[PDB]
Symmetry: C3
Subunit: 116 residues, 3 copies
């Protein structure tokens, strides 16, 4: 029984350690994917905001030129739709990303080193 | 051997329980990050859609004013590009988020309470 | 002691195997959620880019019609804001998604089959 029991414990430690290594990689991959999603979402939010600000300035100019045209045509007050309140939010998941990376490293302390 | 074998089992249970706690936190962090990404992506999708609808109404008005101007200038049919089919999709990962939170809680049932 | 020790090992293997199954599901859920986020972010990035390209073509046409109008009004050089450099990035986390799915399947090899 003692040789089956000790070989069992070795098998358990080895399989556990093996599973922990695989989980560490999966946490690092997850952290990496979240970081890239966070960056692109925030980049595309900033693009949308920049777009909005430049558009409403383009509608301002168009409105001013149209108004000038209309008066000069009377010689022989058009308000375009305001978009400047449209706003894309940014995301912040850095604390969650840091936690996953911290656990991937911390799980090293959970490895089993059996006594021979 | 019996004292090494039992101390081994204690070490294994304790290290496993320790690893499970760390994995639970990582699942909760992942669930939290996915929820925030889902919310911002969907918010910015709605902003883009609202923007599209207001823009094409702005091009409608511009077209109508330009057309009026052109006729009055003849007295002494411009079609602007249609954007109204541009559409941002929304994302729904709530079932995946619920599963991660459910596993974080369920893994409590996987903890080892050894017999002394 | 030998019957407590062997029943302990059974309990450990069973609880570990149980925890591994739950972690596999959580990895598959995470992989699934990342894939859906990647797809919607990239879809909405393409919508934003398509929108930008069609808008600046709409401002080109408006500029050309306004310019024509202004000359005909003189008979009895307006530059609108350029947006064509606004660009939404796409995200690529497929390698991270593949790693999570690969670990979910690989962890099958980490299961414990004890010797009776």
């Amino acid at each position: 029984t003692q040789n089956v029991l000790y070989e069992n414990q070795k098998l358990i430690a080895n399989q556990f350690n093996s599973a922990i290594g695989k989980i560490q990689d999966s946490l690092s991959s997850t952290a990496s994917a979240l970081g890239k999603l966070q960056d692109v979402v925030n980049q595309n939010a900033q693009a949308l905001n920049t777009l909005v600000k430049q558009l409403s300035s383009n509608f301002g100019a168009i409105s001013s030129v149209l108004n000038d045209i209309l008066s000069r045509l009377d010689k022989v007050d058009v308000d375009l739709g305001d978009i400047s309140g449209i706003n894309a939010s940014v995301v912040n998941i850095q604390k969650e990303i840091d936690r996953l990376n911290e656990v991937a490293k911390n799980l090293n302390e959970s490895l089993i080193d059996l006594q021979e």
